[PDB]
């Protein structure tokens, strides 16, 4: 209990840095960058008992997953991907790995001031996204 109580709550994107290069490396495809790159989402982080779920949306799509922390679970990505996912609390920071095909890439999400910054890196390519309370 009250694992992540400073996470939950509504959040809007306020920046983002270097995500259509992050989308690149990730292997998202033209049309689909362009419009997820345009999307302004809210995030949605809520908890009840020892399940999180986390909403993302936006008029590019809403998603929605849940999940206990260390628990593996399957994901469809909002690019289409499907991906075995497992988060987990390392210093106070949700870390969420994505596999598939091979592949890894990692979505760190951590509180610092009033802001909820999200880092997304894949290989050598990271990409910083800042949201804010809503
Ligand atoms: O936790 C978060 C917080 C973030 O702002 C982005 C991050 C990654 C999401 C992207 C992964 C690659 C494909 C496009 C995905 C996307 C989904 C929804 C809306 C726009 C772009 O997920
Ligand atoms: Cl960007």
């Known amino acids: 209990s009250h694992m992540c109580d400073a996470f939950v709550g509504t959040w809007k994107l306020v920046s983002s840095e270097n995500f259509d290069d992050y989308m690149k490396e990730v292997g998202v495809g033209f049309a689909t960058r362009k419009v997820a790159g345009m999307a302004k989402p809210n995030m949605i982080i809520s908890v009840n008992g020892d399940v999180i779920t986390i909403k993302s949306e936006s ?57 909820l910054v999200v880092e997304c890196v894949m290989k050598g390519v990271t990409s910083t996204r800042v949201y804010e309370r809503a």
Do not use: C, M, P, Y
């Open 59 to 115: 008029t590019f799509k809403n998603t929605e997953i849940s999940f206990i922390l260390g628990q593996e679970f399957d994901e469809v990505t909002a690019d289409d991907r499907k991906v075995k996912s497992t988060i987990t609390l390392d210093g106070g920071v949700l870390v969420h790995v994505q596999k598939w095909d091979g592949k890894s890439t990692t979505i760190k999400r951590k509180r610092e001031d009033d802001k």
